[PDB]
Amino acid sequence: ELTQPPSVSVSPGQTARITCSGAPLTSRFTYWYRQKPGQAPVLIISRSSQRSSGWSGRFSASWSGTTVTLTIRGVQADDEADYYCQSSDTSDSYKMFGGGTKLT
Amino acid sequence: HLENVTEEFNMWKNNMVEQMHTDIISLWDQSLKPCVKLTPLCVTLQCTNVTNN
Numbered sequence: 001e002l003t004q005p006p007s008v009s010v011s012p013g014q015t016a017r018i019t020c021s022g023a024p025l026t027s028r029f030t031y032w033y034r035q036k037p038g039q040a041p042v043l044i045i046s047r048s049s050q051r052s053s054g055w056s057g058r059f060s061a062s063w064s065g066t067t068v069t070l071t072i073r074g075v076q077a078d079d080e081a082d083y084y085c086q087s088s089d090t091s092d093s094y095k096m097f098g099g100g101t102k103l104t
Numbered sequence: 105h106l107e108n109v110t111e112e113f114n115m116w117k118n119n120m121v122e123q124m125h126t127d128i129i130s131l132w133d134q135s136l137k138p139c140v141k142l143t144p145l146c147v148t149l150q151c152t153n154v155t156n157n
């Protein structure tokens with residue numbers, strides 16, 4: 001029960017923006033992962049303790065208020081697939097997936 | 105080991121515990137009397153949470 005933009009397009013070699021909006025964005029971070037055609041998802045972003053999460057793999061993410069941001073790195077050449085969103089609920093019970101984006 | 109004696113004790117009406125009590129209080133206050141008083145610490149405090157993230 002969350003919101004994600006299904007289709008955003010941006011210029012290659014430039015920065016991009018992914019959003020996922022919802023209420024329980026206070027209980028358990030965000031997550032995303034990427035879905036290549038016919039392949040299993042991979043960790044786009046992780047959390048090892050507190051702030052040191054986005055950092056220097058590239059990417060980086062920001063959490064404004066209701067919606068969060070996945071400010072990705074500068075180069076965007078060919079790293080294109082479908083992106084979702086994970087996260088848990090305020091009572092930790094269950095997990096909701098609310099679709100996600102396919103960038104080109 | 106006092107022999108043949110059967111003296112009666114009382115641990116609730118015993119005054120060694122009350123002497124103990126008023127000694128610690130006067131001993132604690134004597135160990136704080138000569139130090140830094142923090143009277144200036146009473147101001148309006150503007151505070152925030154920490155890393156809810």
Ligand SMILES: *[C@@H]1O[C@H](CO)[C@@H](O[C@@H]2O[C@H](CO)[C@@H](O[C@@H]3O[C@H](CO[C@H]4O[C@H](CO)[C@@H](O)[C@H](O)[C@@H]4O)[C@@H](O)[C@H](O[C@H]4O[C@H](CO)[C@@H](O)[C@H](O)[C@@H]4O)[C@@H]3O)[C@H](O)[C@H]2NC(C)=O)[C@H](O)[C@H]1NC(C)=O
Nearest residue numbers: 023024025026027065066090150151152153154155156157
């Ligand atoms: C530091 O951390 C503490 C603890 O997390 C925060 O205190 C919490 O603050 C949040 C947000 O202010 C509170 O959550 C709010 O609940 C409102 C309804 O509250 C009623 O019902 C709940 C249960 O459903 C009861 O627990 C509560 O007592 C009330 O009876 C919501 O309406 C809020 O959402 C939105 O609308 C309101 C009203 O318009 C706005 O004021 C809000 O800004 C928001 O737009 C919100 O979900 C929470 O109850 C507080 N305590 C708890 C239990 O966590 C501090 O806010 C935090 N400070 C900072 C700076 O981060």
